[PDB]
Ligand binder design. Sequence first.
Ligand SMILES: NC(=O)c1cc2c(-c3ccc(C(=O)NC4CC4)s3)cccc2s1
Lengths: 8, 273
Amino acid sequence: RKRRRHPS
Amino acid sequence: EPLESQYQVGPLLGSGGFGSVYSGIRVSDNLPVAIKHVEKDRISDWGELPNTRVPMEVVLLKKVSSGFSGVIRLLDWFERPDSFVLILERPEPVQDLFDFITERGALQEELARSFFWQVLEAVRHCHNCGVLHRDIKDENILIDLNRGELKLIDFGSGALLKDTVYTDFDGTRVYSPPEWIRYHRYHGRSAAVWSLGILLYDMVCGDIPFEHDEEIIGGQVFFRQRVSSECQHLIRWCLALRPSDRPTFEEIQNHPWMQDVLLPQETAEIHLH
Ligand SMILES: NC(=O)c1cc2c(-c3ccc(C(=O)NC4CC4)s3)cccc2s1
């Protein structure tokens, strides 16, 4: 698990 | 009144499904602004002002931009052949809560309490003005590091608040509630409280709890960091699988974990300066 942004 | 002569256009900040956002200064008075461009071709939802077919985003921002709050205010906007351009406030210095959490890791509960409280007040502000954000997450929250003030951004996936069912959703899937994953239906407030549960977990644990659909609808919450029993309780309540089991905004702000919040100024002095 890398923390990452998530698109809308 | 051209866009090019009233504002001094700087360089990019970000881009995505929201649009493209540049640094800018109001020449009139050297106010820091954000200049956001949206192509008409890429806009899904449209609305009308009190009179003019504009993007829903402009409709929602006008409704929440009345007086002061924890929402980035729309200062001006412009139509163009193929796009609209929104002029928004830009705090300096600023960091988004997503980069802030990446940099610092899991926040201390005292800090998480102040941040979460200010987000709750900004969302209540939105609901009081008939606006549903539908994309509450760390990336859509700016921190004014000097004032210790959080500001909500990007209403591009929002809607007028209603008490009836929503069957469309354009926000972030990993903050969407189980009832959206399973049935493509949700009510506004109860979906909002779910996303706020994700956000609170994100703050105290250093990342979101769920990545896959199976995890969202499982509503099994594992704490990967030391979190007080009271905070675990509020998070599990916000993340109740049944919408009607989630707390109201009032029940969140009356929750024992939420008491004795720091003021924004305290928050900056103790945790940001
Ligand atoms: N997508 C949107 O709707 C909006 C985004 C913004 C922004 C920023 C984007 C990302 C930022 C950033 O990376 N900051 C670096 C540290 C300076 S600030 C500032 C002011 C208003 C709006 S409205």
